[PDB]
């Protein structure tokens, strides 16, 4: 999927 | 894409051999001195797809096709890109050589993804 | 871990082929270590149950300046990047070499890239 | 120990 990436 | 410029082997499992490819032709009448740019990332428009995993990003890293051949790694990502166990400084072009190890989702064992690359001096010589 | 066999037919999942450190060294013999390649599940890195594949097919072995070196004891041949090795006879081994047994018919076909990890020779 | 089939005329 495209969402907004999971930033550490 | 007519001739092979390197083969990537993923190591960690989770994606069969693919190779880079670029028509020498084609690359010929690029102007721009980055003759042919590969982007990897999690959306599956990208030219390698690295899968569904959260922390990847949508556009992660490019190797770009240099004026004569050069193999360049540029990181684009949110939560980077390592070269040979090291991370790369974002945004700042690496120049890739042969067996070089291109890793992402480092930080969370189970996402781990690394691949191995390996580059056709034949098509660098015949370009 | 000394190197990772990577399976790019698809009929074997990833494996990594291992060697404590130390008693290699404690050992005096030219070569270290042998790891043997096969369709006899007593060998280290079993090759599956096909029939034209050897018991012992191939080995790996590990030399003593951290080298991994390829020897073809079969009776159908053993492959080096494309090329039919000579039986009997070690071929050194380079990072993403690939091994391929059972040409010559299609289904027997297998391929493996070895993968060399750098971090064992500098233990070496 | 299941003797290993042989290439004969089509052996590599």
Redesign the interface.
Known sequence: ???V???? | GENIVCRVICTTGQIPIRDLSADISQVLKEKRSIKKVWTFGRNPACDYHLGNISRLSNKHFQILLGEDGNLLLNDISTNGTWLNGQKVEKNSNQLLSQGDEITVGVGVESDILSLVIFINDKFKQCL
């Open positions: 999927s495209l969402e990436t999971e930033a550490d």
